[model samples]
Target: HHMETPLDLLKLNLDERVYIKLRGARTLVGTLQAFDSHCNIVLSDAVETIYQLNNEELSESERRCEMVFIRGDTVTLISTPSAVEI
Candidate 1:
């Protein structure tokens, strides 16, 4: 197929709910609204999660944003919810 790049894949996500992995163990799940070559993106109904390590285990915290903007450099990965759940 013609989609040979991550940017292309991300392009297909427009208006669709997507997952984004970020630095600092943070991740976001929401509807992709906008993006640029820099990978900077905007999402609506975004939920942010931060996973952390405890002395003997792992923990996670969750937050929400009606709309959110994420810096491109912070983005580590992107995938659809279904594909990710598979």
Candidate 2:
């Protein structure tokens, strides 16, 4: 599908799970419930992954949320999940 604009791409994924990369080495995966022009988003059943780097050893922690809100300023990128069923 050809998306004429960025929002066109996002509209294709409405109600679908999405991967969001954030600042501060954090990432989130969840069903996108709602989003606004400013990019404020509401997600359901979200899992938040936080990455920590210590002396070349990287560690990550996962936190689950039944519902989550993400601020637009912290969002770096948004994309469809890689592991979607065919």
lDDT of 1 by residue, 1-86 (tens): 57478777777889999999888557799999999998899999999886779896788888988999999888988889963985
Best TM-score among the predictions, by candidate number: 2
Q: Which stretches in model 2 have alpha-carbon errors above 4 Å?
A: 1-3, 52-58, 83-86
lDDT for position 69 in model 1: 93
Q: Residue 25 in candidate 1 has what lDDT?
A: 55
Error of 1 at 85 (Å): 16
Could you tell me which 10 consecutive residues in candidate 2 have the lowest summed lDDT?
Answer: 1-10
TM-scores for all candidates?
Answer: 0.75, 0.77
Local distance difference test values of all predictions, in order: 0.88, 0.87
lDDT of 2 by residue, 1-86 (tens): 65377766677778899999898657899999988888888889899997779999898888999999999889989889885998
